Amino acid sequence: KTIWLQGFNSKYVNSRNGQGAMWCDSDTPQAWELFTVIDAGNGKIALRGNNGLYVSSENGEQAMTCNRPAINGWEVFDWISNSDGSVSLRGSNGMYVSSENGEQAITCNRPAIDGWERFNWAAATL
């Protein structure tokens, strides 16, 4: 299924069409804010963005992207289901996807879940 991910700053995770880094900066979920959750096997998930490419952790080396033409790895995630119904995403490197409060592009370099690393999600299409 296709979902949007809403970050700590109340904006939505934006694939940026695979140009440059991903950001948590959109006011409303539209095509670029819809991600197909992929069952990558063994509790791991991947995310296919609007451009048909896959979200990568970049191993924490740089801000996260949505440009990979195929899942390997840096593109599989643990989908952690939090107490409050939110989700966190843990990358290949054991670090957590962070919305960075919209202050900078999204990262996967933080070793623990805090506010910025919890997302509200709901299924949506079109």
Residue 32 binding result from ligand BGC, its own copies, none, given CB thresholds of 5 to 8 Å by partner type = ligand BGC
- Please select the residue that binds ligand BGC; options are 2, 30, 51, 120, rule is CB under 6 A: 30
Q: Which stretch, 14-22, 28-36, 59-67, 102-110, contacts its own copies (CB under 8 A)?
A: 28-36
Amino acid at site 21:
A
Shortest separation between residue 66's beta carbon and ligand BGC, angstroms:
12
Residue number with CB closer to ligand BGC (50 or 92)? 50
- Please select the residue that binds its own copies; options are 13, 66, 71, 108, rule is CB under 8 A: 71
Rounded to the nearest 5 degrees, what angle is found at the Cα of 94, between the Cα atoms of 99 and 32?
Answer: 35
Tokens representing 115?
Answer: 């506010």
Under 8 Å CB-to-CB from 62, ≥6 apart: which residues? 21
Q: Check binding of 33 to ligand BGC (CB under 6 A).
A: yes
CA-wise closest residue to 105 among 56, 69, 70: 56
Under 8 Å CB-to-CB from 36, ≥6 apart: which residues? 1, 2, 47, 48
Q: Which stretch, 30-38, 76-84, 102-110, 112-120, contacts ligand BGC (CB under 6 A)?
A: 30-38
Q: Check binding of 1 to its own copies (CB under 8 A).
A: yes
Say whether 16 sits in a helix, a strand or coil: helix
Residue 41 binding result from its own copies, ligand BGC, none, given CB thresholds of 5 to 8 Å by partner type = its own copies
